[PDB]
Amino acid sequence: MTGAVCPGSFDPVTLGHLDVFERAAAQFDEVIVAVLINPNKAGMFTVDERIEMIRESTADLPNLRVESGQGLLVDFVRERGLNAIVKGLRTGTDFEYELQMAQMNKHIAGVDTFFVATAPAYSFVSSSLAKEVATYGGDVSALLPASVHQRLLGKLR
Amino acid sequence: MTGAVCPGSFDPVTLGHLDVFERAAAQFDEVIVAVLINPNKAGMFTVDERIEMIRESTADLPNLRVESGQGLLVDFVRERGLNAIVKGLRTGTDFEYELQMAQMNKHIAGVDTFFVATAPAYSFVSSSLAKEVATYGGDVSALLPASVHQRLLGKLR
Amino acid sequence: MTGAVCPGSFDPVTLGHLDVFERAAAQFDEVIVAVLINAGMFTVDERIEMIRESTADLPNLRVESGQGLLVDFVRERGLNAIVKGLRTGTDFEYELQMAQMNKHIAGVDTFFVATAPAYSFVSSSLAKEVATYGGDVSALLPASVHQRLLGKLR
Amino acid sequence: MTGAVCPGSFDPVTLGHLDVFERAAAQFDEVIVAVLINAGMFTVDERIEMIRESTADLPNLRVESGQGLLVDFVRERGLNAIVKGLRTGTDFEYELQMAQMNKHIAGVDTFFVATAPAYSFVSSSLAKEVATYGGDVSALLPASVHQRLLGKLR
Amino acid sequence: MTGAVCPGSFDPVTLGHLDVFERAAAQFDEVIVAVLINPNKAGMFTVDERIEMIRESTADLPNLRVESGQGLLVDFVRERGLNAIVKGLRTGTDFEYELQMAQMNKHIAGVDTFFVATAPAYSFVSSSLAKEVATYGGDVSALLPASVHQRLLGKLR
Amino acid sequence: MTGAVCPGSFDPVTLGHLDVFERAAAQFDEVIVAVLINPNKAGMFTVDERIEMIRESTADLPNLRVESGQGLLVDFVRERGLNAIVKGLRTGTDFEYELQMAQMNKHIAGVDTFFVATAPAYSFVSSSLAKEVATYGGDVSALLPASVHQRLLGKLR
Ligand SMILES: Nc1ccccc1-n1ncc(C(=O)O)c1C(F)(F)F
Ligand SMILES: Nc1ccccc1-n1ncc(C(=O)O)c1C(F)(F)F
Ligand SMILES: Nc1ccccc1-n1ncc(C(=O)O)c1C(F)(F)F
Ligand SMILES: Nc1ccccc1-n1ncc(C(=O)O)c1C(F)(F)F
């Protein structure tokens, strides 16, 4: 059985992330989405809220599961019998930064990273920019899953 | 039942390519190396020679096979009942160019592309630069598998 | 009386190009599309025709063929601005060199716009290549252009 | 009636910025410099003042402070174009994301211009940093700004 | 009488840095490693510790010396009667950022900057990423000189 | 004695090249400008014309000499008792390409490469773009040494 981990803060999950999840679940026997908890930045949504939002949006992916993770990612991956990470990239400068992390993760733990190019429609979407825009009344409903948008309006109120 | 195609001209295969093959073979049930031939431009090596050099250096990968082709890569992929391409990247400029072809390939045929970061040792190795340096007498033995180096020197002489 | 020139080979014009034309047309009183003679699929007249067909709804745009220095083309028509679309940061680096050169020699400025997201991967070159091998590029090209491209391949 | 907004923190405005203002002013009937309140050296009023002082020769330019979404600022003034300067391909990538977002949510377009070559290395941040340690940045800043910067450091 | 300054925070020095030091020392009559301290931000290591770690791994470079400083790098350079800075680069984004500082430094003080490309093996090594990975238990022994690794582990414990 | 080689086609030498030559001659005891002859592309100026133009523009650099070179650059460098190359860069994408060549040259012959950032005024100038512009009556006199411009007008007639 093949498998990969899709890591991120997902605060909140976007349609870009979801596209990556779907494409991973289509090519690996199992996919684990790792929602990374950071004690430093606490973000807009709690880890449990983030997990629930992802589960709602991935309800039709039976071979994908969602968990919280903390600390060194390659430990999270290897603890679950896997040794691949799958991540989306939206630009060359994204690649450069992620490349050093991928080479580091391969060096320290033998864990591989597979990158997928963003769907063209979501090349400009990020969690941070979506939150920023929404905070000032901008409409980001076309960039987020249905599950997220309603919950986002709520947090803003 | 998972699988991916690793495409290239492989004229000749490099250690960088072999690294990608090994990493693909580790993460997918089957891997097909697609030796893509330009029927209008002979390279340095014939199709038979390219395939032999790849086979000799992949003998320890039981789930990898090598086949040639031409025309649209996505047709090669789909006619084998697969839907994924695996390719290596070295730079951010690599990524921009490949992103465009990856997005085109997904658009016209639904085929996805997964990129892996080059092993650091091979980030400067290319088929073209290896051929160029060897043409002028530089030592490229450490960048090419054994199956390649002296065949290359033979071509040049 | 504002104006800009949108240059390119446009062989053929894509929906990515048309997007840039419309955006230029929305912000400048006068837009001239400059079809540059440089070697490819469509003749200059054919390219001009495909563009005119696809830009009928833009009253302040016209299409002309051009040769020689782009800056001469621009200045001989009383303008001093170029409008061009970009997809990547590598696009910017290459175009930046030409933009600074053009400003240096003739005082002609260049305004760049970011590609629409949907057309990130579309280029004349790649569309021709894919169509040549039977790939469907109908969603990447103006309706008129697409039929004409089929015709060339036959 | 064409127009564009040139946004930034301008803390302080540099000769690189002023170059972009002049170039925008040359191609659009109306330019509004938007001084964004976000945390730094000069107050909003001070930044506005330094810009007005340095743009007296541009009759079709005015300077206003802004808060909230840039697209709201732009649309509430009847415009739908942003003009911004770029130095590198990395600049383009970051700005491209915001430009496509801004177009998506409000239909506001963005036009980028390449920096003048002489100002490739100038930024408000680096000029302040260097001046703070006694480096001479007088050739990188408008005459007025430079005196005012000295004053802040004293 | 030729000479160059190799600047950095070196918190801690990496094998990538050491490679740059060695290459500078090979091409200039004297090299000064400038340990630049932010008087307002303690790093992980004190100035004395940073200098010791660099000295212990450069003992075989007779024409290299190590000194700390703060403020404008160009003043450090000129007060030693020198006019050149030598720095390593890994990426094109590295280059854009350093180009801006190099052009500023030439403008204000006439000091030139020479960049060298990272050794391929170290292209993913940074002081910050090494500290981050070690903080969470990853093995970074092969990216840091002997003079550094266990001191780092000691800091973390 | 320290030294470096400054390689290029220099067809014709530009003020950007000259800035690099001056900065190299200021930091190394000797500099050799290697005018690379290519049998494929024959260019606008003969090798001897290119050498003469460079000598005129570098008349006040007594520690810089100009020679023609052919074949593998690292052989040219090592044959002259040197093991450094100095080259200018005008952008990050220039760096990426040159980086692979620098890593290759270091690998095959132990020859180092030092890069210098372009003077801001010449960031847009190249031999090719200068020739192209001049061919159609554009004025590139501010971008080329005095020696070149007159000779360029002549070739165009
Ligand atoms: N936008 C996007 C599209 C495809 C794949 C990934 C992304 N992506 N990458 C990082 C992030 C983030 O904001 O955290 C995202 C996005 F949020 F999903 F858009
Ligand atoms: N060098 C390299 C390393 C990892 C994956 C791929 C490669 N790669 N990439 C492009 C090319 C090329 O020849 O064009 C190669 C290489 F050839 F395998 F080395
Ligand atoms: N990694 C590296 C390799 C060669 C030259 C320099 C470095 N380098 N570059 C930046 C940095 C950094 O720590 O920020 C380093 C490293 F730290 F030495 F590794
Ligand atoms: N333009 C420039 C500026 C500083 C250093 C180098 C250059 N450079 N680099 C390559 C080339 C070339 O055209 O062959 C040049 C230039 F031609 F000098 F501008």
Short mmCIF file of N, CA and C in Angstrom, two decimals, chain C residues 4-55:
data_model
loop_
_atom_site.label_atom_id
_atom_site.label_comp_id
_atom_site.label_asym_id
_atom_site.label_seq_id
_atom_site.Cartn_x
_atom_site.Cartn_y
_atom_site.Cartn_z
N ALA C 4 -1.91 53.45 -25.67
CA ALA C 4 -0.85 52.46 -25.54
C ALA C 4 -0.82 51.49 -26.71
N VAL C 5 0.35 50.91 -26.96
CA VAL C 5 0.55 49.88 -27.97
C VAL C 5 0.72 48.51 -27.31
N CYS C 6 -0.03 47.52 -27.80
CA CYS C 6 0.11 46.14 -27.33
C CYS C 6 0.81 45.30 -28.40
N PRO C 7 2.09 44.98 -28.19
CA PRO C 7 2.87 44.30 -29.22
C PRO C 7 2.90 42.79 -29.06
N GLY C 8 3.14 42.08 -30.16
CA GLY C 8 3.33 40.64 -30.09
C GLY C 8 3.35 40.04 -31.47
N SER C 9 3.72 38.77 -31.56
CA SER C 9 3.64 38.05 -32.83
C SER C 9 2.21 37.56 -33.06
N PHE C 10 1.52 37.22 -31.97
CA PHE C 10 0.12 36.77 -32.02
C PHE C 10 -0.12 35.73 -33.12
N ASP C 11 0.56 34.60 -33.00
CA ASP C 11 0.53 33.56 -34.03
C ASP C 11 0.05 32.21 -33.49
N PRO C 12 -1.25 32.08 -33.16
CA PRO C 12 -2.31 33.09 -33.24
C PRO C 12 -2.55 33.79 -31.91
N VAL C 13 -3.34 34.85 -31.96
CA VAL C 13 -3.83 35.48 -30.75
C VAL C 13 -4.56 34.46 -29.88
N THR C 14 -4.31 34.50 -28.58
CA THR C 14 -4.99 33.64 -27.61
C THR C 14 -5.99 34.40 -26.75
N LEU C 15 -6.76 33.68 -25.93
CA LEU C 15 -7.64 34.34 -24.97
C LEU C 15 -6.84 35.12 -23.92
N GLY C 16 -5.61 34.69 -23.66
CA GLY C 16 -4.70 35.43 -22.79
C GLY C 16 -4.37 36.80 -23.35
N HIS C 17 -4.09 36.85 -24.64
CA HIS C 17 -3.83 38.12 -25.32
C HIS C 17 -5.08 39.00 -25.32
N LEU C 18 -6.21 38.42 -25.73
CA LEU C 18 -7.45 39.17 -25.81
C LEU C 18 -7.81 39.81 -24.47
N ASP C 19 -7.57 39.09 -23.38
CA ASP C 19 -7.77 39.60 -22.03
C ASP C 19 -6.93 40.86 -21.82
N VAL C 20 -5.67 40.82 -22.25
CA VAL C 20 -4.80 41.99 -22.09
C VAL C 20 -5.29 43.15 -22.96
N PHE C 21 -5.69 42.86 -24.19
CA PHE C 21 -6.25 43.90 -25.07
C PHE C 21 -7.44 44.61 -24.42
N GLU C 22 -8.38 43.84 -23.87
CA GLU C 22 -9.58 44.40 -23.25
C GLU C 22 -9.23 45.26 -22.04
N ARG C 23 -8.24 44.81 -21.27
CA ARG C 23 -7.82 45.53 -20.08
C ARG C 23 -7.10 46.81 -20.42
N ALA C 24 -6.28 46.77 -21.47
CA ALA C 24 -5.64 47.98 -21.98
C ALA C 24 -6.72 48.94 -22.50
N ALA C 25 -7.63 48.41 -23.30
CA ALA C 25 -8.71 49.23 -23.87
C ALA C 25 -9.57 49.91 -22.80
N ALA C 26 -9.67 49.29 -21.63
CA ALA C 26 -10.47 49.85 -20.54
C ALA C 26 -9.78 51.00 -19.80
N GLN C 27 -8.47 51.15 -19.97
CA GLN C 27 -7.74 52.13 -19.16
C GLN C 27 -7.05 53.23 -19.96
N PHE C 28 -7.03 53.08 -21.29
CA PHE C 28 -6.41 54.05 -22.19
C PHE C 28 -7.40 54.45 -23.29
N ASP C 29 -7.40 55.72 -23.69
CA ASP C 29 -8.34 56.18 -24.72
C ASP C 29 -8.16 55.47 -26.07
N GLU C 30 -6.92 55.11 -26.37
CA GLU C 30 -6.54 54.57 -27.67
C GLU C 30 -5.64 53.36 -27.46
N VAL C 31 -5.99 52.22 -28.05
CA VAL C 31 -5.08 51.09 -28.06
C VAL C 31 -4.77 50.64 -29.48
N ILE C 32 -3.48 50.48 -29.77
CA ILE C 32 -3.08 49.91 -31.04
C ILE C 32 -2.41 48.55 -30.82
N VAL C 33 -3.00 47.50 -31.38
CA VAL C 33 -2.32 46.22 -31.35
C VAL C 33 -1.32 46.16 -32.49
N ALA C 34 -0.06 45.92 -32.13
CA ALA C 34 1.02 45.87 -33.10
C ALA C 34 1.41 44.44 -33.39
N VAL C 35 1.06 43.97 -34.59
CA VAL C 35 1.40 42.61 -35.00
C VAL C 35 2.76 42.63 -35.67
N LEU C 36 3.74 42.01 -35.02
CA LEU C 36 5.12 42.17 -35.44
C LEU C 36 5.57 41.13 -36.46
N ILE C 37 6.09 41.61 -37.59
CA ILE C 37 6.67 40.73 -38.60
C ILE C 37 8.13 40.44 -38.26
N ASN C 38 8.45 39.17 -38.07
CA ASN C 38 9.77 38.76 -37.59
C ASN C 38 10.59 38.03 -38.64
N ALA C 39 7.61 33.39 -40.26
CA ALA C 39 8.48 32.48 -39.52
C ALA C 39 7.64 31.48 -38.74
N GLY C 40 6.35 31.43 -39.05
CA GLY C 40 5.41 30.63 -38.29
C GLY C 40 4.18 30.18 -39.04
N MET C 41 3.05 30.09 -38.34
CA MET C 41 1.86 29.43 -38.89
C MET C 41 0.98 30.36 -39.72
N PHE C 42 0.62 31.51 -39.17
CA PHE C 42 -0.29 32.42 -39.85
C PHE C 42 0.45 33.59 -40.49
N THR C 43 -0.06 34.07 -41.62
CA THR C 43 0.50 35.27 -42.23
C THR C 43 0.11 36.50 -41.41
N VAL C 44 0.85 37.59 -41.60
CA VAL C 44 0.55 38.85 -40.92
C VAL C 44 -0.91 39.25 -41.12
N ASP C 45 -1.38 39.18 -42.37
CA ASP C 45 -2.76 39.53 -42.67
C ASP C 45 -3.74 38.63 -41.92
N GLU C 46 -3.40 37.35 -41.84
CA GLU C 46 -4.27 36.41 -41.15
C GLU C 46 -4.34 36.74 -39.66
N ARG C 47 -3.19 37.05 -39.08
CA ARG C 47 -3.12 37.37 -37.65
C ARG C 47 -3.89 38.64 -37.34
N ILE C 48 -3.67 39.67 -38.16
CA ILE C 48 -4.44 40.89 -38.05
C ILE C 48 -5.95 40.61 -38.10
N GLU C 49 -6.36 39.79 -39.07
CA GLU C 49 -7.77 39.45 -39.24
C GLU C 49 -8.36 38.77 -38.01
N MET C 50 -7.65 37.77 -37.49
CA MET C 50 -8.11 37.04 -36.31
C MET C 50 -8.26 37.98 -35.12
N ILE C 51 -7.34 38.94 -34.99
CA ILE C 51 -7.43 39.88 -33.88
C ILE C 51 -8.60 40.84 -34.05
N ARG C 52 -8.74 41.43 -35.23
CA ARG C 52 -9.87 42.31 -35.51
C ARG C 52 -11.20 41.61 -35.25
N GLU C 53 -11.33 40.37 -35.72
CA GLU C 53 -12.53 39.57 -35.49
C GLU C 53 -12.85 39.43 -34.00
N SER C 54 -11.81 39.20 -33.19
CA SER C 54 -11.98 38.95 -31.77
C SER C 54 -12.09 40.20 -30.92
N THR C 55 -11.85 41.37 -31.52
CA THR C 55 -11.90 42.63 -30.79
C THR C 55 -12.95 43.61 -31.33
#
